[PDB]
Amino acid sequence: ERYENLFAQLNDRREGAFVPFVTLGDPGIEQSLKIIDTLIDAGADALELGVPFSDPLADGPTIQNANLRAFAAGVTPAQCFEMLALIREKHPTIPIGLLMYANLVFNNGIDAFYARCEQVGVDSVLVADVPVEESAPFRQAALRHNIAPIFICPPNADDDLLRQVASYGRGYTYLLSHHLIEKLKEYHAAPALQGFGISSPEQVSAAVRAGAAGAISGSAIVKIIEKNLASPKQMLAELRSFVSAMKAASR
Amino acid sequence: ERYENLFAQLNDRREGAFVPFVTLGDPGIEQSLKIIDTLIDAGADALELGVPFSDPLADGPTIQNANLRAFAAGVTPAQCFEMLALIREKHPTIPIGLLMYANLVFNNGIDAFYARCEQVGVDSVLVADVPVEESAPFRQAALRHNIAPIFICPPNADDDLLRQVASYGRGYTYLLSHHLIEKLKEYHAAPALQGFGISSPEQVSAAVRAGAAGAISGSAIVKIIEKNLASPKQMLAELRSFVSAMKAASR
Amino acid sequence: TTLLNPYFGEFGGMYVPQILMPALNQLEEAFVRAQKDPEFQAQFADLLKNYAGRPTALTKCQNITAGTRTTLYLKREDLLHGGAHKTNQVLGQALLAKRMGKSEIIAETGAGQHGVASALASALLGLKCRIYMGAKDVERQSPNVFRMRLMGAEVIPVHSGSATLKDACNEALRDWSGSYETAHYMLGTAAGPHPYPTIVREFQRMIGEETKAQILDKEGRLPDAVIACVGGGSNAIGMFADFINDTSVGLIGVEPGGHGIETGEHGAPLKHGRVGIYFGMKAPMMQTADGQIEESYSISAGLDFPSVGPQHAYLNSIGRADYVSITDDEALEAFKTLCRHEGIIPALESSHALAHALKMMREQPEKEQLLVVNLSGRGDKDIFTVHDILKARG
Amino acid sequence: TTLLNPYFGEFGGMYVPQILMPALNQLEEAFVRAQKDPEFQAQFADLLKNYAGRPTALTKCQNITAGTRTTLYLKREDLLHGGAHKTNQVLGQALLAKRMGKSEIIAETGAGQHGVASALASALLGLKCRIYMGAKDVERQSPNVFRMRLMGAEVIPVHSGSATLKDACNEALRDWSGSYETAHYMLGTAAGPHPYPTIVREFQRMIGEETKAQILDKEGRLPDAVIACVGGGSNAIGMFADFINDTSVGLIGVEPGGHGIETGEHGAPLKHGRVGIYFGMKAPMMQTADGQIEESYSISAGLDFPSVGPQHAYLNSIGRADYVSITDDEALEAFKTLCRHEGIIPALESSHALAHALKMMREQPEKEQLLVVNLSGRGDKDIFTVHDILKARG
Ligand SMILES: O=C(NCCOP(=O)(O)O)c1ccc(OC(F)(F)F)cc1
Ligand SMILES: O=C(NCCOP(=O)(O)O)c1ccc(OC(F)(F)F)cc1
Ligand SMILES: *Cc1c(COP(=O)(O)O)cnc(C)c1O
Numbered sequence A, B: 001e002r003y004e005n006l007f008a009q010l011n012d013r014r015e016g017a018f019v020p021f022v023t024l025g026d027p028g029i030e031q032s033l034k035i036i037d038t039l040i041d042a043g044a045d046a047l048e049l050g051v052p053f054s055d056p057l058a059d060g061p062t063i064q065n066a067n068l069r070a071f072a073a074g075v076t077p078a079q080c081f082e083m084l085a086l087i088r089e090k091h092p093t094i095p096i097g098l099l100m101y102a103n104l105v106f107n108n109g110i111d112a113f114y115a116r117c118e119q120v121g122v123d124s125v126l127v128a129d130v131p132v133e134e135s136a137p138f139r140q141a142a143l144r145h146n147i148a149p150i151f152i153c154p155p156n157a158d159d160d161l162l163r164q165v166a167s168y169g170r171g172y173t174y175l176l177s178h179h180l181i182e183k184l185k186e187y188h189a190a191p192a193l194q195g196f197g198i199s200s201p202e203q204v205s206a207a208v209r210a211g212a213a214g215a216i217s218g219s220a221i222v223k224i225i226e227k228n229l230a231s232p233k234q235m236l237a238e239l240r241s242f243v244s245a246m247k248a249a250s251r
Numbered sequence C, D: 001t002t003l004l005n006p007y008f009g010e011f012g013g014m015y016v017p018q019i020l021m022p023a024l025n026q027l028e029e030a031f032v033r034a035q036k037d038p039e040f041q042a043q044f045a046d047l048l049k050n051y052a053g054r055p056t057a058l059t060k061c062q063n064i065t066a067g068t069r070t071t072l073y074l075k076r077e078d079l080l081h082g083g084a085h086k087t088n089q090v091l092g093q094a095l096l097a098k099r100m101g102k103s104e105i106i107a108e109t110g111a112g113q114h115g116v117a118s119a120l121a122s123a124l125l126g127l128k129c130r131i132y133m134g135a136k137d138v139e140r141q142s143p144n145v146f147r148m149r150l151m152g153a154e155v156i157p158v159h160s161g162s163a164t165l166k167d168a169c170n171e172a173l174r175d176w177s178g179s180y181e182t183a184h185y186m187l188g189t190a191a192g193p194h195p196y197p198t199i200v201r202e203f204q205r206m207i208g209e210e211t212k213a214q215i216l217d218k219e220g221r222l223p224d225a226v227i228a229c230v231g232g233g234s235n236a237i238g239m240f241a242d243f244i245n246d247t248s249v250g251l252i253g254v255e256p257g258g259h260g261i262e263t264g265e266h267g268a269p270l271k272h273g274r275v276g277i278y279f280g281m282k283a284p285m286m287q288t289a290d291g292q293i294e295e296s297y298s299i300s301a302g303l304d305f306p307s308v309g310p311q312h313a314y315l316n317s318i319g320r321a322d323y324v325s326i327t328d329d330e331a332l333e334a335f336k337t338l339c340r341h342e343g344i345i346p347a348l349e350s351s352h353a354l355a356h357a358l359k360m361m362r363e364q365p366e367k368e369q370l371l372v373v374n375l376s377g378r379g380d381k382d383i384f385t386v387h388d389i390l391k392a393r394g
């Protein structure tokens, strides 16, 4: 719902969406909440938030470090959900998407997980290690709780995969860093957001020109956090400047 | 020759022979020569002398240590022969027997070894690791140089071995610590000298009573040397008392 | 879709990022093809026979069972080239890599045995092998690390995270996701995403096949039970496979009990864990109440895997196979007993299987039973571990 | 007299104190009896097959010979239980001990491999094993010492003399001279007094017999040459024996050259020693000008024997077998080459044999030749030795 409204609004303004990613609780619950409010105040159109997991076979160094920092702060999934509730209470319209690993969703029951997402105000969930082939239980539970199931569309995706992603996904299609963008639109897929490697303003403008509805940036954001660990204030200052620059490129 | 004269003389006096064993050069060339003169002056009827060898698979600890001490003094077979020449020059009638290991006899030629023995005045040679079965070359070379080849007669020796030892040996039969003594005499074997474990006067008298012509004592002698290493004079004093006591038991 | 069933009941699956699905699909197709290719089977059989030393012996252990009605045989995988059963399947996987036109091998290891096995197979078949290993492990397994490098493998220390194997398990997968066209990921056990549990079982199946032929020749009948230790599940499923349809044959898997199940310091996820989704599969695993993957423990590094192959979870669920646990102390006693009574030094991993067989015998000495223990490996590598423990106890 | 010829030409014999002759005669008679006893042969064959793992593979090494006309096979004694060929004959000797009604085994060891082999055989066959070992050796071979004790053997440290093996070789003989009625002296190589050189050869003969059958099956003809390292001479005579009458088959024995023959620091008595009498036999040996037994040297402790089996000296004398030497550096290069190109870690002892085969190939790359190297053992035990040397050289 929030995604539909956002993209409709962005379209009327002929601009793309800029979506930063950060790990909840990195480097601490307090600082993480401040980081997120700064990202939003700086121009973030939506958020992708990760929940610290012990065995994440999909994240790179920058993000791996984020989880370590969060765990060093004693961050747990329960605390992450408490943070999410607070974030939603402060920002009623911004779409909030979670980046999860299957075990944390399956742990206490798939249905229960999505029900918790719905109660705190989460809009979408991308389960990193659940390919479309194993997605049935996840996307069904997601839809039952008005949560958009997000799917990754690789650049080499064949026709069958494009059709599956277009049919199963909601909110937005996570396009890994064109004609696929055209094919996805042909199959009425959710608006595409390009992710992976987006760290400069020109990449955001390029994504929008290619036909994508926006771009996602994570490592670039998290790197700013880890380089200003000893200076919380400078960390927020740097994040504000980066996000504002990236968002400007989408207009 | 010297053995025949000795035993003939001992018989006329109704007494047995006492034969001490020591390693040439233990603990040094000088002290060894003194030790030997003391053994003779104390009553030794004959001598059994060992030549330090690196790999002697037949000697016990006491004797193994003697070789180590001799080697630590730089004693070589050549020096041992120089000592033998000197010993003979000082004592013309005492029978001198060598206890050798096969390699030192075979090294520069078996014939040459026995020729060297004859030139320095040695009377017999017992090669520890040459059983009667392998003795042909050794006993033949020995006899060619007027050296008596000595053979060990084990206590369990069967009839064939007794006959072989009686036929091949000369000088004396080395009997390892009775009826064998009677059987050896029956086969006209060289006079028997009991060896191994003889360390007390009563053992010497017992050997003579059993019919043996005498007894050989080594470890007991060498032990006196190693216990008085720091006191050369006391070493000779102790050796004199021990040898005199053992010789007295043979009268 | 897939050519073969990725599940064993509710267990298994292909829980990997979408980007890795093409690699799994390619592998499955290549495997199915290889399995029906007489030439592939012949080449594999040739390597197993002439390079690895198969068939391995089936040794009757008469001293150990004296005074009881137990007859015990040991399937001698400790005599296989490399000293452990791992060699069988790495040779098969290396051949699959070549069938797919690949010249590179990617692997990761903890105890180091799989790294060594991967390295030897790669050296023999002319494959460029790179092995990811946790910095902490590279420190505790210096011997195995040198073996890997001696055999031309590139050992890559990964410091990320608690530098345990899970950091290299992922490091390997990240690499593979962008190099699978020219590199094959040589998974080390009968676990992970389909088709690995199936491939590893089939490439270890000769253990059970030989055991069946050998026991029939020697005893004229099948075993009352075959017993094998379970870390990831490869040597056990290799022994079990050919006997699954022989309902009279018991299948007993032995997980490490560590310091005791009640202490929480063990490696028995199948019977004391909770089903979860990790390492590309749905299977029982060591995990916290909120879903974080827990750490396993065992005196034997080789059984220190926090989860277990899906087929074992399935066989357990339907009651075809039974799983038990053996503690560090029970494994140590079995290790010492085999050394003294049969002159065979068993791997501490295998010692867990032997320990359970010893329990079966000792608890009911008058019970007539014919047992086969899969001696998965030799224990020369465990001499120092056993030594230190013994001395520490005076 | 004796039942069999104690000599190989001028070499051999029974140069032991008279007290030990009954023991040798008893042993010879028992051996001759055993050799004609179908039951003894069957029991020995059963242990070799079902306990030790025979037959061992004959591995074709294609990577190593690439670009040349040499075809190289490795007889895999490294796959035998224990990791070395020594196991074959200790099992045979243990059976002989039992045939003579003995329940005790006496042995001595330097590198520790023979001690371990003796211990495992004794454990399997219920024999009380006591092993004499030099204090210095017991210090440098802690791993092997623990293996021996793990298997129930009593390891007796002997401090006498330069506590090298020669002090325990004798310590063992002294014991045996007074206990031979109930204890058997398990000599470790094809040397010493008759009947040992003969017994050890016959109990190692299967190496050559299998090699012949295997090479005929694989190549349809005999090898142009079989190559084996020579420490005492057991693995080499074991490989050579069945080929002696096949005049077209070259027999090449490789002695350790250490730092180089010209340095005097080597272990090549057969070609650079002098005939002498020691250890109960007449054979070439490392000795000073005046007859003291010299010390041998080799990077490989297993080839550090100061003399050599009499049958090798004989085969050399008549020109049937040819003997050469390989230096530490040549052995090390062969060790590293086999690891990287075939995925097999060879014992440093065996590496000497491989090194010569590599020389035969490299020196004349266009010479068509079919060679078999006896891979007498695996080299996991040499990993640290090779490591230290490599590091020391940066
Ligand atoms: O959304 C996340 N990345 C955001 C930005 O990527 P980057 O800017 O390169 O960190 C993101 C999404 C999915 C993911 O798992 C897998 F790789 F398997 F798909 C990992 C990271
Ligand atoms: O004559 C020597 N011993 C003299 C005294 O013996 P003991 O008094 O006990 O040292 C002597 C003679 C032979 C010998 O070799 C072998 F044992 F093999 F026969 C060892 C020592
Ligand atoms: C690797 C190993 C194991 C554990 O792995 P599984 O996959 O469970 O078989 C067991 N025994 C030995 C000797 C091993 O090397």
Ligand SMILES: *Cc1c(COP(=O)(O)O)cnc(C)c1O
Pocket: D083, D084, D085, D086, D113, D114, D188, D189, D190, D229, D230, D231, D232, D233, D234, D235, D236, D302, D303, D347, D349, D350, D376, D377, D378
């Ligand atoms: C003992 C050993 C040798 C040396 O002994 P030989 O009797 O000369 O064979 C050679 N290779 C290995 C692996 C050994 O263990």
Ligand code: NA
Pocket: C230, C231, C232, C267, C268, C269, C303, C304, C305, C306, C307, C308
């Ligand atoms: Na496990």
Ligand code: NA
Pocket: D230, D231, D232, D267, D268, D269, D303, D304, D305, D306, D307, D308
């Ligand atoms: Na030698």
